[PDB]
PDB file of C-alpha atoms (C1' of nucleotides) in Angstrom:
ATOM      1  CA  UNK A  16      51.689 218.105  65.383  1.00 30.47           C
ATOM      2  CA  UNK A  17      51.203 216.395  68.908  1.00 29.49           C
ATOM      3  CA  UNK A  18      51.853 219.057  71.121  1.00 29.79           C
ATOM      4  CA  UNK A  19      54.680 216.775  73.699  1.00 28.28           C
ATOM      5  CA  UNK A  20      56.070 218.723  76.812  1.00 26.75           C
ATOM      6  CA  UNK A  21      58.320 216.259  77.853  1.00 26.55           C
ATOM      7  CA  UNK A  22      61.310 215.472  76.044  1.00 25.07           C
ATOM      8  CA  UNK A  23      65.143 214.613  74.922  1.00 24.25           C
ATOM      9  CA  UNK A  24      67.764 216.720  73.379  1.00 22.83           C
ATOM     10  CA  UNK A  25      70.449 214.367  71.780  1.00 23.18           C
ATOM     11  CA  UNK A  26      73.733 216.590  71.330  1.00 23.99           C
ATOM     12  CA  UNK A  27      75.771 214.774  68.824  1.00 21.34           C
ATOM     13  CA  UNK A  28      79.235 216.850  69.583  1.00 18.26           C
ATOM     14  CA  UNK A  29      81.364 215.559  66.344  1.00 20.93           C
ATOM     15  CA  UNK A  30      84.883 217.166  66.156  1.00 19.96           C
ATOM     16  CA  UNK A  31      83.566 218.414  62.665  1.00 20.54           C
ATOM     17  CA  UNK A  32      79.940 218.959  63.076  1.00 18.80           C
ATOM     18  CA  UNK A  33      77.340 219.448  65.865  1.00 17.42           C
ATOM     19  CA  UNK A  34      73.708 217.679  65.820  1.00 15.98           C
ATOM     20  CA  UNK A  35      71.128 218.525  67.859  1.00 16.95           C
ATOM     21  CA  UNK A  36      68.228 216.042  67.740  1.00 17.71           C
ATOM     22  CA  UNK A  37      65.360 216.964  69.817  1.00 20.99           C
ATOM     23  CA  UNK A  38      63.212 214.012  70.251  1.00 20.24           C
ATOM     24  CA  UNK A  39      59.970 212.644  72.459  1.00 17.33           C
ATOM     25  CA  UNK A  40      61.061 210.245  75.140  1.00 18.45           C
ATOM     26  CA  UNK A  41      59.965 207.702  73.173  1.00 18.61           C
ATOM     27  CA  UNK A  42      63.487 208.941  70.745  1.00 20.07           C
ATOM     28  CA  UNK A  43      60.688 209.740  67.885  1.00 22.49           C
ATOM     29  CA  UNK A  44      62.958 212.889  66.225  1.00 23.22           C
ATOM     30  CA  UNK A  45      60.909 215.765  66.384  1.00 21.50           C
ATOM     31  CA  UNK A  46      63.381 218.305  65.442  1.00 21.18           C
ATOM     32  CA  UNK A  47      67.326 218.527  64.307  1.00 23.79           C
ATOM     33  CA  UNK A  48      70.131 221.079  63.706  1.00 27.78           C
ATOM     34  CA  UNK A  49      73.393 221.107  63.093  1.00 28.48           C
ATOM     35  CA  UNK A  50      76.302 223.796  63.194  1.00 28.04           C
ATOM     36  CA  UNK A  51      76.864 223.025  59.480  1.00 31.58           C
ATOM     37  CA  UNK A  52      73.786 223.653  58.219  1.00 31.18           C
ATOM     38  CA  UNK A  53      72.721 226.722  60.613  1.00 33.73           C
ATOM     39  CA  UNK A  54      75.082 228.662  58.575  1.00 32.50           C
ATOM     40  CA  UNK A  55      78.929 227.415  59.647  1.00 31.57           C
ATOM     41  CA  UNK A  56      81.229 225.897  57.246  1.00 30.35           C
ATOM     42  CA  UNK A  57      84.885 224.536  57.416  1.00 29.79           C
ATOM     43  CA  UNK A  58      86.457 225.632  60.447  1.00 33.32           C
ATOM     44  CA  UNK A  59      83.692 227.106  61.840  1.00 35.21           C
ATOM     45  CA  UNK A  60      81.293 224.473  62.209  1.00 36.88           C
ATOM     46  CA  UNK A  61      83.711 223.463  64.901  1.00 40.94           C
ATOM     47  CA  UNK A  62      83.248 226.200  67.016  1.00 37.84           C
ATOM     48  CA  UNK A  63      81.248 225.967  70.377  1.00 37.29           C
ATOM     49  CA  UNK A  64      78.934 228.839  68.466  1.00 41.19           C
ATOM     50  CA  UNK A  65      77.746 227.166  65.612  1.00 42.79           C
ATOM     51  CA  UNK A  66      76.738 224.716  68.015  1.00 41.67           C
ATOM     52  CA  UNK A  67      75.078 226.920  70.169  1.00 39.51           C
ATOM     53  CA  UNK A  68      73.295 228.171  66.629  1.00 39.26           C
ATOM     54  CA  UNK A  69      72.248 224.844  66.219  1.00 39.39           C
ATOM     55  CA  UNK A  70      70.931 224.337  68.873  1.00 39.02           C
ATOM     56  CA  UNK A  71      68.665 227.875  68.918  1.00 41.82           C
ATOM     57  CA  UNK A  72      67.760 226.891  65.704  1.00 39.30           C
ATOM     58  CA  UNK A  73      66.479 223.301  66.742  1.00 41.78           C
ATOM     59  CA  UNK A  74      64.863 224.886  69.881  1.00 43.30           C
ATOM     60  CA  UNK A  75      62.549 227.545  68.546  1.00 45.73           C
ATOM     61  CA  UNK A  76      61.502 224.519  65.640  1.00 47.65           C
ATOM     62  CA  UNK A  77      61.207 222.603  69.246  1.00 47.62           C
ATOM     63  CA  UNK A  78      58.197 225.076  70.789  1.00 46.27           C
ATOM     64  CA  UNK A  79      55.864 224.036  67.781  1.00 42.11           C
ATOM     65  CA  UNK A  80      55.725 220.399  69.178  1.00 38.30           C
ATOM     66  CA  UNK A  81      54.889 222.754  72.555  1.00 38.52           C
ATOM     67  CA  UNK A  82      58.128 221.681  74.528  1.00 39.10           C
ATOM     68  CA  UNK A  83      58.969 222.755  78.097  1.00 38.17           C
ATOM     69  CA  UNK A  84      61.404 219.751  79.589  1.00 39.07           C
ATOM     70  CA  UNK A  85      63.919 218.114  77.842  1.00 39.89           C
ATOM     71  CA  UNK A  86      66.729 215.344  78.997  1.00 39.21           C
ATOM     72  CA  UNK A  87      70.243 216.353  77.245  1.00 38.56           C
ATOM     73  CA  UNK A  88      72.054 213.801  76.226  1.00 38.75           C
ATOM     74  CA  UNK A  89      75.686 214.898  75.454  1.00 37.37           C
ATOM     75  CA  UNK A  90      77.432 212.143  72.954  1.00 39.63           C
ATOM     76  CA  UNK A  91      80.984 213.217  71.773  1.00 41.19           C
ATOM     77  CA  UNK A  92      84.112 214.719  72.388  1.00 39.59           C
ATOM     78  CA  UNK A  93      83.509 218.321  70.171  1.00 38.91           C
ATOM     79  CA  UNK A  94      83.403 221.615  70.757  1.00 38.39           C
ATOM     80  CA  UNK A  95      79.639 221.453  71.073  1.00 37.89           C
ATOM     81  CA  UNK A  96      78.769 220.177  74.061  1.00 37.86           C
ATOM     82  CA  UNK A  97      78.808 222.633  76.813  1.00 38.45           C
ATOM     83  CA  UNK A  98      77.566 225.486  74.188  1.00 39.04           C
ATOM     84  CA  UNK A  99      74.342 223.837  72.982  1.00 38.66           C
ATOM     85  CA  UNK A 100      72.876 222.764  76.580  1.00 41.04           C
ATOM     86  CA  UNK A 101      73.207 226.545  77.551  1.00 38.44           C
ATOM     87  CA  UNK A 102      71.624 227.568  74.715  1.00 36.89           C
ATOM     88  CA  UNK A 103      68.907 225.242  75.784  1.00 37.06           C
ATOM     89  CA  UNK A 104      68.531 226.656  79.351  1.00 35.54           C
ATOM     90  CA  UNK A 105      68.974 230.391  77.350  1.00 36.94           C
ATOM     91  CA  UNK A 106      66.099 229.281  75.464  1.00 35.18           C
ATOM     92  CA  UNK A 107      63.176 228.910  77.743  1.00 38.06           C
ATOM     93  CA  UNK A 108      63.170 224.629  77.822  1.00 37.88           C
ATOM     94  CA  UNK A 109      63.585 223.474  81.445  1.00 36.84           C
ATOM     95  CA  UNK A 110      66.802 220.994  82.308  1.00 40.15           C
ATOM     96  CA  UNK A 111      65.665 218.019  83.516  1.00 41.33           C
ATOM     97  CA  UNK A 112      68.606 215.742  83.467  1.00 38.05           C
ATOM     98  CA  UNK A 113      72.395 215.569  81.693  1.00 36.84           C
ATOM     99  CA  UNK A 114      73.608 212.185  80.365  1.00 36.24           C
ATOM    100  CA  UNK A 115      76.565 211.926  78.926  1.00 35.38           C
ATOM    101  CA  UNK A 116      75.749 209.318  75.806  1.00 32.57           C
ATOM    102  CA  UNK A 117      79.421 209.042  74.241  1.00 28.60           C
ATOM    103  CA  UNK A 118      79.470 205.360  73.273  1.00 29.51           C
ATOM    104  CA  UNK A 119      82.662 203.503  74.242  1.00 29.22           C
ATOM    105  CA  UNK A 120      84.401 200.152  73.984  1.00 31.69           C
ATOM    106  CA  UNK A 121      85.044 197.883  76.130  1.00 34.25           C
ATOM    107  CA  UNK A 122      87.873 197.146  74.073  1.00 34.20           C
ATOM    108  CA  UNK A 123      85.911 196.233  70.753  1.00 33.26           C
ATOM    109  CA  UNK A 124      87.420 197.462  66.907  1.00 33.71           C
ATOM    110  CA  UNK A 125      90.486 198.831  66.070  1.00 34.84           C
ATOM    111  CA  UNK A 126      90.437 202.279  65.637  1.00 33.52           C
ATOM    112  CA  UNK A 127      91.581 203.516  62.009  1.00 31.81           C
ATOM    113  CA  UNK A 128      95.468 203.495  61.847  1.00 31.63           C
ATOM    114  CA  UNK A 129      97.512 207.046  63.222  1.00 33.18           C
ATOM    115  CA  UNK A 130      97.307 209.849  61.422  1.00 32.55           C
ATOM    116  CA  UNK A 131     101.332 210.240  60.146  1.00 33.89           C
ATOM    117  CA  UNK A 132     100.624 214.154  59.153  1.00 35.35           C
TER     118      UNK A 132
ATOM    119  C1'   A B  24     150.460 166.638  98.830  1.00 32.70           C
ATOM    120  C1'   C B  25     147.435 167.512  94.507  1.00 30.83           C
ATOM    121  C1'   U B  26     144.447 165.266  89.978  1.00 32.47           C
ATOM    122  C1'   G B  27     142.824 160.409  88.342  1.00 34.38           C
ATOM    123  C1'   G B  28     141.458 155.045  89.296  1.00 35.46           C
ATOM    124  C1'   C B  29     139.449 151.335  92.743  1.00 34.04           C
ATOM    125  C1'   A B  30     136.768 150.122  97.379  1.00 34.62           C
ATOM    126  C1'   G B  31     134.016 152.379 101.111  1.00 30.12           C
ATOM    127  C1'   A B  32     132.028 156.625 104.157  1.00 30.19           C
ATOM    128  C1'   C B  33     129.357 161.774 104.512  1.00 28.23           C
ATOM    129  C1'   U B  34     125.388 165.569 103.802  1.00 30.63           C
ATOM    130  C1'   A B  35     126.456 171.251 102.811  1.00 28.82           C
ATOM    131  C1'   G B  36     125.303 170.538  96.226  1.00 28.51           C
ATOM    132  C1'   A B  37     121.273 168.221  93.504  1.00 28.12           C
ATOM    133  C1'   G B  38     116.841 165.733  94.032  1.00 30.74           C
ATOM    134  C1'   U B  39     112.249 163.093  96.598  1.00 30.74           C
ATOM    135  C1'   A B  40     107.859 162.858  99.995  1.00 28.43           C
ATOM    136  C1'   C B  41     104.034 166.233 102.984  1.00 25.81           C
ATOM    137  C1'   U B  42     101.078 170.707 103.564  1.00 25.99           C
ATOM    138  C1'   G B  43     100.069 175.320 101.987  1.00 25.81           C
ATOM    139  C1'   U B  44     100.432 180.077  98.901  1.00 27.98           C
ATOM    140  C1'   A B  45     100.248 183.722  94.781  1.00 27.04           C
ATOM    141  C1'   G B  46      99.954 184.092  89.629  1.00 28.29           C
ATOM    142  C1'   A B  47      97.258 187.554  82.100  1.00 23.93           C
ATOM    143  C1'   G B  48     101.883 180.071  82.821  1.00 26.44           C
ATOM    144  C1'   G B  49      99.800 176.535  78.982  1.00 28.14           C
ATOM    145  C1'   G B  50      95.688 173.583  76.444  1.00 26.72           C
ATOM    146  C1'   G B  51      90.322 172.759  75.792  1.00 29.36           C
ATOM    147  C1'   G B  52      85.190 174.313  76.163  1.00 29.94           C
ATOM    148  C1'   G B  53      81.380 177.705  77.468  1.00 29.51           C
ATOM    149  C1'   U B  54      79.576 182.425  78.408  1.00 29.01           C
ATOM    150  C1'   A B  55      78.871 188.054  79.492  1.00 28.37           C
ATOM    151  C1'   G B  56      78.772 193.147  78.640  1.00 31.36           C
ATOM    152  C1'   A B  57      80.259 197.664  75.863  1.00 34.78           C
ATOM    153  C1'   A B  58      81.130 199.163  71.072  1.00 35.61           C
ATOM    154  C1'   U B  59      81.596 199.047  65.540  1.00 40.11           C
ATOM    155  C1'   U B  60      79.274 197.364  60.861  1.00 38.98           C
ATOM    156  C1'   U B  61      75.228 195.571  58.191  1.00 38.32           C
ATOM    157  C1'   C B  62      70.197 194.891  58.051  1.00 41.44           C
ATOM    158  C1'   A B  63      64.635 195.677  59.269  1.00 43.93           C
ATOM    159  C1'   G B  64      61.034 198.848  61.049  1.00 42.64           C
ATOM    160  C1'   G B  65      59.521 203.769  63.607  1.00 42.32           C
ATOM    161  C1'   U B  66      60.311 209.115  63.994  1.00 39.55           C
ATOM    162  C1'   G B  67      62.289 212.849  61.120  1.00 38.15           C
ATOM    163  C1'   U B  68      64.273 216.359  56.916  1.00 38.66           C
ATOM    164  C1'   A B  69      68.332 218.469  54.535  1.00 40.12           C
ATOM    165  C1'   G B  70      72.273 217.682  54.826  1.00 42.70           C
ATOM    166  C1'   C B  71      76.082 214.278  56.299  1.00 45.29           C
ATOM    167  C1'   G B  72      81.089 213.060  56.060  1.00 45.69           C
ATOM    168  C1'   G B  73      85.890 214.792  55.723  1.00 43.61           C
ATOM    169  C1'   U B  74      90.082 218.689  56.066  1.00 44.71           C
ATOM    170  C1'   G B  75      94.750 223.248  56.959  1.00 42.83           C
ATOM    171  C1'   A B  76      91.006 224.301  53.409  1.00 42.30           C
ATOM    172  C1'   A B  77      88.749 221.123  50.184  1.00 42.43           C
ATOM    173  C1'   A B  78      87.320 217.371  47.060  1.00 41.74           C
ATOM    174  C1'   U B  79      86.250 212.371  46.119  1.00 39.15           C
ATOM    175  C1'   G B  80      82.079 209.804  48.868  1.00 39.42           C
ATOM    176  C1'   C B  81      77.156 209.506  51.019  1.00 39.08           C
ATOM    177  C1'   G B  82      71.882 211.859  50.969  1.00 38.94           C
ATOM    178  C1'   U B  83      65.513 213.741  48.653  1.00 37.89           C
ATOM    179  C1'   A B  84      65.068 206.501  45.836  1.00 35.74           C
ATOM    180  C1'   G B  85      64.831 209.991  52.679  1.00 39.93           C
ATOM    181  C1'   A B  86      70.939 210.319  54.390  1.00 37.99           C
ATOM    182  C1'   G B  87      73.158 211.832  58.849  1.00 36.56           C
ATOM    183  C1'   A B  88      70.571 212.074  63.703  1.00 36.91           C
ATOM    184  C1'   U B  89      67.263 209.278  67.020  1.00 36.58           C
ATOM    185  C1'   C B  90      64.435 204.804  68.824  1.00 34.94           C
ATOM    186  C1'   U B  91      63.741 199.606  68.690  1.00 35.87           C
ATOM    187  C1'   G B  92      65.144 194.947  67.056  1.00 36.89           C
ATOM    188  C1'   A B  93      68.126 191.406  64.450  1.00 34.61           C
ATOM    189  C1'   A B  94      72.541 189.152  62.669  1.00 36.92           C
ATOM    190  C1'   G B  95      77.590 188.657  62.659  1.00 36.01           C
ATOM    191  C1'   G B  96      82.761 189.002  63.713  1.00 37.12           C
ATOM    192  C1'   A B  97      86.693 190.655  66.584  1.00 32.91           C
ATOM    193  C1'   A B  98      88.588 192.541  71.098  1.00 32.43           C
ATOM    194  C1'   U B  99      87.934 192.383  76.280  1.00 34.58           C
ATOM    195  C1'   A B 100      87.010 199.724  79.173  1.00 34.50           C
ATOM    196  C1'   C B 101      87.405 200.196  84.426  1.00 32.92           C
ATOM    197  C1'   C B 102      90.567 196.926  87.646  1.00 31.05           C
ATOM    198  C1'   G B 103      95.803 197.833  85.579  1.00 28.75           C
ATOM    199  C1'   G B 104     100.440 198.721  88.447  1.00 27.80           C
TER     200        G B 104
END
RNA sequence: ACUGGCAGACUAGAGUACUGUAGAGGGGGGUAGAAUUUCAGGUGUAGCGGUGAAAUGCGUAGAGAUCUGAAGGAAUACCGG
């Protein structure tokens, strides 16, 4: 390990799934957990408390890299996003800054075709 | 008288010249930025993806995530009504 206290938490806020990627600034991963492997499954990875779980989960595997500051940045439309920051501030690591990270066009590809359900 | 013909006349219709104005009008060429995909390398480690739920699929040969770069094609967020 080199112990970093500066860094990045990448929230990747899926409908389905959450990630949380906590990185160096340098976006070397250093840790990563997501609601559907922290336990949740089906419906309830897409909860804003898997998330959340995912995110304790990626946060007390952050602490062995020695982490105190982290940058969030939130990329999606899930449940996920609000959930996992707090458990971020709820777990010690001092906010620096919150980007927003969801990528969008500027009118690019078609989007898959409607869902007729 | 009215319609037509013929020979004139007229400027209201129609058109011309002049100067501006707005405009995703058209054709040609170039270029920008965002994003997707693929690819290469770095970090990283067990999921990812998907759904009503799931399975097919993808992943330990290292995925997904994340960083950087590259290459392509297509379409031009906001403005925008």
């Amino acid at each position: 390990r080199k112990q970093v206290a500066d860094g990045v938490a990448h929230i990747h806020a899926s409908f389905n799934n959450t990630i949380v990627t906590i990185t160096d600034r340098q976006g070397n991963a250093l840790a990563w957990a997501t609601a559907g492997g922290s336990g949740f499954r089906g419906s309830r990875k897409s909860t804003p408390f898997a998330a959340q779980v995912a995110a304790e989960r990626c946060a007390e595997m952050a602490k062995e890299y020695g982490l105190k500051n982290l940058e969030v940045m939130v990329k999606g439309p899930g449940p996920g996003r609000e959930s996992t920051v707090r458990a971020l501030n709820a777990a010690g690591f001092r906010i620096t800054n919150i980007v927003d990270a969801t990528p969008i066009p500027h009118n690019g590809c078609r989007p898959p075709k409607k869902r007729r359900v």
